[PDB]
Amino acid sequence: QVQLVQSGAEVKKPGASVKVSCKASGYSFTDYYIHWVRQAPGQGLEWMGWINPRFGGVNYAQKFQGRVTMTRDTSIRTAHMELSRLISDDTAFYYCARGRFADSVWNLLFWGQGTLVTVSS
Amino acid sequence: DIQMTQSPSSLSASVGDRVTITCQASQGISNYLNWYQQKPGKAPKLLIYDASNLETGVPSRFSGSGSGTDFTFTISGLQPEDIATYYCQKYEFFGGGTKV
Amino acid sequence: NLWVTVYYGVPVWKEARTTLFCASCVPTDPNPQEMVLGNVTENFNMWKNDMVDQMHEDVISLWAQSLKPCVKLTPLCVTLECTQVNADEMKNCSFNTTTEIRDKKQKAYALFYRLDLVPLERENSASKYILINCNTSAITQACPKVNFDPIPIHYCTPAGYAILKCNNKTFNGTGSCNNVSTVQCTHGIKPVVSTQLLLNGSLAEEEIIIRSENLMDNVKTIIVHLDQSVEIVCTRPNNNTVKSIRIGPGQTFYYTGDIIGNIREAHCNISEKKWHEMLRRVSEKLAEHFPNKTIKFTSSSGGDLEITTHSFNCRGEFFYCNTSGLFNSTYMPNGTYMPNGTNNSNSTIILPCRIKQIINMWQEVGRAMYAPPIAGNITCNSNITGLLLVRDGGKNNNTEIFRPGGGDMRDNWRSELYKYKVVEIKPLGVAPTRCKRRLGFLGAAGSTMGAASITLTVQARQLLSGIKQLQTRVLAIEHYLKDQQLLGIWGCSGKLICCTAVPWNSSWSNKSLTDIWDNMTWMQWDREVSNYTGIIYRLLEDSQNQQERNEQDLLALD
Amino acid sequence: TLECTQVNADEMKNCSFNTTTEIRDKKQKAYALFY
Ligand SMILES: *[C@@H]1O[C@H](CO)[C@@H](O[C@@H]2O[C@H](CO)[C@@H](O[C@@H]3O[C@H](CO)[C@@H](O)[C@H](O)[C@@H]3O)[C@H](O)[C@H]2NC(C)=O)[C@H](O)[C@H]1NC(C)=O
Ligand SMILES: *[C@@H]1O[C@H](CO)[C@@H](O[C@@H]2O[C@H](CO)[C@@H](O)[C@H](O)[C@H]2NC(C)=O)[C@H](O)[C@H]1NC(C)=O
Ligand SMILES: *[C@@H]1O[C@H](CO)[C@@H](O[C@@H]2O[C@H](CO)[C@@H](O)[C@H](O)[C@H]2NC(C)=O)[C@H](O)[C@H]1NC(C)=O
Ligand SMILES: *[C@@H]1O[C@H](CO)[C@@H](O[C@@H]2O[C@H](CO)[C@@H](O)[C@H](O)[C@H]2NC(C)=O)[C@H](O)[C@H]1NC(C)=O
Ligand SMILES: *[C@@H]1O[C@H](CO)[C@@H](O)[C@H](O)[C@H]1NC(C)=O
Ligand SMILES: *[C@@H]1O[C@H](CO)[C@@H](O)[C@H](O)[C@H]1NC(C)=O
Ligand SMILES: *[C@@H]1O[C@H](CO)[C@@H](O)[C@H](O)[C@H]1NC(C)=O
Ligand SMILES: *[C@@H]1O[C@H](CO)[C@@H](O)[C@H](O)[C@H]1NC(C)=O
Ligand SMILES: *[C@@H]1O[C@H](CO)[C@@H](O)[C@H](O)[C@H]1NC(C)=O
Ligand SMILES: *[C@@H]1O[C@H](CO)[C@@H](O)[C@H](O)[C@H]1NC(C)=O
Ligand SMILES: *[C@@H]1O[C@H](CO)[C@@H](O)[C@H](O)[C@H]1NC(C)=O
Ligand SMILES: *[C@@H]1O[C@H](CO)[C@@H](O)[C@H](O)[C@H]1NC(C)=O
Ligand SMILES: *[C@@H]1O[C@H](CO)[C@@H](O)[C@H](O)[C@H]1NC(C)=O
Ligand SMILES: *[C@@H]1O[C@H](CO)[C@@H](O)[C@H](O)[C@H]1NC(C)=O
Numbered sequence: 098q099v100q101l102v103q104s105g106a107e108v109k110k111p112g113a114s115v116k117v118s119c120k121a122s123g124y125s126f127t128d129y130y131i132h133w134v135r136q137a138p139g140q141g142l143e144w145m146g147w148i149n150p151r152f153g154g155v156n157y158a159q160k161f162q163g164r165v166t167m168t169r170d171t172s173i174r175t176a177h178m179e180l181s182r183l184i185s186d187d188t189a190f191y192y193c194a195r196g197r198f199a200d201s202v203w204n205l206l207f208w209g210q211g212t213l214v215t216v217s218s
Numbered sequence: 219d220i221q222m223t224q225s226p227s228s229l230s231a232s233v234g235d236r237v238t239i240t241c242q243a244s245q246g247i248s249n250y251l252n253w254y255q256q257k258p259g260k261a262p263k264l265l266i267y268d269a270s271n272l273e274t275g276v277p278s279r280f281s282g283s284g285s286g287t288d289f290t291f292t293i294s295g296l297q298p299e300d301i302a303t304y305y306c307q308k309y310e311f312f313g314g315g316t317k318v
Numbered sequence: 319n320l321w322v323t324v325y326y327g328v329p330v331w332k333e334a335r336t337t338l339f340c341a342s343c344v345p346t347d348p349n350p351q352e353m354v355l356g357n358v359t360e361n362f363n364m365w366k367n368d369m370v371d372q373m374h375e376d377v378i379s380l381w382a383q384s385l386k387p388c389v390k391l392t393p394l395c396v397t398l399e400c401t402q403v404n405a406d407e408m409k410n411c412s413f414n415t416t417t418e419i420r421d422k423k424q425k426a427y428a429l430f431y432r433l434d435l436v437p438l439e440r441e442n443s444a445s446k447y448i449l450i451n452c453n454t455s456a457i458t459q460a461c462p463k464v465n466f467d468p469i470p471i472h473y474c475t476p477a478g479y480a481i482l483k484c485n486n487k488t489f490n491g492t493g494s495c496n497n498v499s500t501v502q503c504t505h506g507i508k509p510v511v512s513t514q515l516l517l518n519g520s521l522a523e524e525e526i527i528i529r530s531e532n533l534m535d536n537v538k539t540i541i542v543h544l545d546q547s548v549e550i551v552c553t554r555p556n557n558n559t560v561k562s563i564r565i566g567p568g569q570t571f572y573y574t575g576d577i578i579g580n581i582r583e584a585h586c587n588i589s590e591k592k593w594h595e596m597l598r599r600v601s602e603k604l605a606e607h608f609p610n611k612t613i614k615f616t617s618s619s620g621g622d623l624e625i626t627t628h629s630f631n632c633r634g635e636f637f638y639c640n641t642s643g644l645f646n647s648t649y650m651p652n653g654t655y656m657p658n659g660t661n662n663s664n665s666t667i668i669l670p671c672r673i674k675q676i677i678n679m680w681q682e683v684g685r686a687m688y689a690p691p692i693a694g695n696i697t698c699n700s701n702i703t704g705l706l707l708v709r710d711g712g713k714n715n716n717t718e719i720f721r722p723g724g725g726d727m728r729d730n731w732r733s734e735l736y737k738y739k740v741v742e743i744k745p746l747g748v749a750p751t752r753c754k755r756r757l758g759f760l761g762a763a764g765s766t767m768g769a770a771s772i773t774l775t776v777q778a779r780q781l782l783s784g785i786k787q788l789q790t791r792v793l794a795i796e797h798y799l800k801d802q803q804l805l806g807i808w809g810c811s812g813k814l815i816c817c818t819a820v821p822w823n824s825s826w827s828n829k830s831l832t833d834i835w836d837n838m839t840w841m842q843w844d845r846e847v848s849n850y851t852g853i854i855y856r857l858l859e860d861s862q863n864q865q866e867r868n869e870q871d872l873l874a875l876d
Numbered sequence: 877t878l879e880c881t882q883v884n885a886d887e888m889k890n891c892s893f894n895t896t897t898e899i900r901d902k903k904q905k906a907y908a909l910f911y
Contacts, residue, residue, distance in 0.1 A: 219713055219714055220534070245534065247534070248532065248534070309534070309535040309536070309537075309711070310535070310536060310711045310712060
């Protein structure tokens with residue numbers, strides 16, 4: 098069974114950095130792209146970025162460049178995302194997702210549990 | 219930039235009525251649109267992998283079709299279990315969502 | 319009035335995938351014997367070719383078949399006592415290893431790069447380190463006889479198949495191609511491994527040819543195929559003295575003993591004028607695909623050293639250039655290129671390549687490689703013949719940010735096996751005639767059905783009838799024998815043009831003889847009568863069974 | 877050689893041993909329960 102297990106909710110102050118992890122179990126980690134999707138509380142789904150765990154390639158969206166770092170630890174099959182310079186507008190549910198096939202990676206069939214990040218004073 | 223335009227923003231329907239949701243891409247030239255049923259508190263679920271092809275584990279009551287910059291998603295009779303926000307997606311671009 | 323006539327040897331082919339064999343592996347012939355197919359247009363798809371998957375498998379198999387009979391550095395996965403090289407970038411590491419006689423030990427000192435070591439304790443006096451990834455897998459030392467100079471590989475067909483080259487000088491890679499040629503073997507393709515920049519490739523005949531599977535998403539690699547090469551010259555100026563120790567019965571470990579003279583960083587020189595002219599033309603060609611957008615080139619946004627730097631093999635040494643002074647430009651729709659003044663310059667762009675020795679081979683994880691040092695210095699020249707770009711996705715203010723990419727080595731081989739398609743010949747077919755019973759390979763592929771029914775003994779003879787090749791020889795034999803058995807069951811054994819007693823049904827095709835034999839090619843005919851071959855073949859075998867029983871009845875009458 | 881005691885923390889024994897670790901210069905002490 099393919100599963101994605103993400104870390105629990107976290108609370109940060111403006112200007113802090115938050116690290117979110119997405120343990121991946123059930124499949125070959127180094128053959129599929131992992132997409133990190135940010136769900137604003139009531140404003141829809143922002144794609145934000147993809148990581149390729151084979152060589153660690155990343156493609157951060159042109160909005161979240163400079164603030165969203167993605168990394169991967171293949172020895173424990175876990176992906177990591179870091180978001181710096183948090184602002185109150187960054188409160189959202191951060192989702193880890195994978196495509197059904199390596200050839201077509203946008204068909205986000207497999208999703209983990211949402212990680213709630215709250216930014217407030 | 220490929221802006222997704224999704225309508226209606228709010229759809230009022232009872233059990234058994236036919237539900238029609240539209241999504242208008244800014245640029246298409248490819249039948250690559252996905253539809254996501256998001257239940258409150260849960261991560262979205264993929265129903266229509268590709269513009270028309272259906273996803274395993276989804277009953278036949280869900281369907282859709284289209285091409286280019288104009289796609290249509292339908293439900294052949296709304297069920298009590300089908301209350302969700304439906305989103306369209308093309309590549310990294312997500313729509314605004316339709317609350318059903 | 320029209321009857322089914324069975325033809326064998328028709329210039330008809332279908333798409334298929336076979337295990338084409340290299341030929342540096344088998345000596346090549348004088349010429350590829352290219353037959354240009356007039357009036358033939360075929361659909362290519364560079365991003366779904368199998369010749370690339372086969373080349374990838376061949377390369378990851380030849381490489382892993384040359385390090386098998388080589389020393390494995392198991393005895394060197396020991397704690398190292400490393401100090402600074404002040405006799406960081408390099409460390410002077412002392413260790414106690416195993417010697418040839420399996421009862422003694424040996425003390426040695428080698429100079430390793432800091433990128434090759436991982437601390438076992440807080441890094442500072444000596445500190446403890448081990449070789450990178452030595453506690454996760456075995457590190458295999460390359461034998462001194464391993465050839466690190468790419469050797470051109472020619473892919474030749476097995477019997478029964480053909481390679482359809484594309485000679486349209488402005489083809490991107492996907493879509494219909496005219497002026498299609500048939501060849502027996504490909505040109506010499508060098509298995510050059512390089513990231514971000516394609517080296518020692520073939521240049522575009524006419525202009526810069528931007529090619530991608532879909533220039534609308536941000537996942538597919540964008541390959542820029544250049545028309546004029548930019549020359550890059552890379553060097554390791556350090557004068558190294560190589561020492562070696564024996565770590566087993568005939569297992570010799572080679573390492574850098576000392577360095578003569580000063581310590582200088584490795585670097586690569588690219589002329590500023592030629593690079594920025596290249597990037598100007600690539601920015602104008604990319605403006606033809608993303609109209610009214612701003613085109614920017616920036617450095618990679620993340621990843622491992624193998625994809626954030628320019629990785630290449632220079633006389634065995636594995637360099638890793640920064641390439642952030644190259645990819646720094648903005649081109650706007652007004653036609654002005656921002657970092658201007660680079661068209662009358664004499665400057666050079668010095669890229670500080672780093673050197674690494676324990677190279678994580680491909681991405682197998684469970685197999686590394688040690689590149690032994692070479693005494694003296696190293697200089698390599700190469701031609702930059704293309705770029706690997708990745709486009710940044712998401713919302714933007716009408717600006718594209720094309721950042722270098724790579725790592726996946728299929729996109730380095732999809733830039734020289736772009737014009738080649740593999741097809742399987744279908745020499746057996748049927749067509750209506752008035753007949754009742756009672757040059758080169760594929761040269762006529764574009765000719766009409768009445769001018770291709772004379773060149774049948776030429777596409778028939780070229781059917782030519784370890785495990786990877788032997789299975790395709792057996793498969794070719796099986797296909798030949800199945801076609802012969804079909805002809806025999808139909809009563810057509812020993813004939814290339816066979817008239818039968820099955821009438822033509824107008825529901826199969828209602829075209830007249832002057833609309834088929836005189837106006838259509840055999841490919842168009844196959845595309846027409848294809849849903850009906852399971853009916854025609856059954857009718858042919860039933861008619862032959864009736865004729866055989868009538869013949870034995872006539873031959874028993876007397 | 878294993879140094880095995882009874883599992884009173886027979887059918888199973890609590891065996892201590894000195895084995896080789898990942899780095900080919902150190903050793904490792906471990907304890908396992910074997911039948
Ligand atoms: C791209 O192609 C060029 C030219 O084919 C390659 O550079 C050439 O590499 C070979 C093999 O490393 C060099 O020959 C060697 O020379 C040394 C010293 O003379 C000798 O000891 C070796 O046995 C061998 O003959 C050759 O000189 C060199 N050419 C130039 C002009 O520098 C280049 O490496 C290729 N690039 C890639 C990334 O594969
Ligand atoms: C690397 O370190 C070794 C010692 O670990 C150095 O070798 C010693 O160099 C001194 C120089 O005065 C000699 O007197 C010693 O006899 C050498 N020892 C051995 C065991 O050979 C070596 O010179 C250092 N090399 C570099 C390049 O820093
Ligand atoms: C291989 O050895 C390296 C170096 O000892 C290990 O990396 C360390 O692992 C420990 C595990 O507790 C970490 O706390 C250290 O921070 C790591 N050090 C560095 C410099 O990264 C590595 O984990 C070992 N490999 C395996 C598979 O255990
Ligand atoms: C098996 O034996 C080992 C010792 O060989 C026991 O481990 C010790 O358990 C005591 C319990 O009080 C601890 O205080 C020691 O620190 C432990 N030693 C080590 C090295 O871990 C172990 O508990 C025994 N287990 C069973 C199931 O009998
Ligand atoms: C080699 O072995 C000796 C044994 O006394 C030890 O003192 C020394 O530190 C060892 N060398 C290294 C580099 O660990
Ligand atoms: C190559 O293909 C393009 C596709 O538009 C076509 O316009 C062009 O004429 C072709 N070139 C040749 C030499 O056939
Ligand atoms: C490549 O050329 C074909 C010719 O039919 C065209 O349809 C396709 O859009 C082109 N693609 C790119 C990425 O240039
Ligand atoms: C077709 O390719 C051949 C290859 O030799 C070339 O000579 C010929 O001029 C090409 N024709 C066109 C129309 O591009
Ligand atoms: C690169 O250019 C610099 C300019 O200072 C020069 O010193 C160096 O020798 C050149 N390197 C090569 C390999 O040509
Ligand atoms: C290249 O050098 C710049 C210098 O500022 C540095 O920031 C960058 O990280 C380096 N890139 C790589 C891939 O090491
Ligand atoms: C390195 O130094 C040695 C000894 O001085 C000398 O013989 C050799 O030619 C030098 N090599 C280079 C490449 O400078
Ligand atoms: C680069 O290409 C030019 C094209 O004329 C050629 O003369 C030169 O030898 C090539 N250089 C290398 C290093 O292959
Ligand atoms: C290709 O078509 C032209 C059309 O004029 C014709 O003259 C020529 O003979 C044809 N070539 C072949 C090989 O069928
Ligand atoms: C492990 O090695 C030590 C070395 O002093 C020894 O005393 C001990 O008995 C060994 N352990 C076992 C289980 O044999």
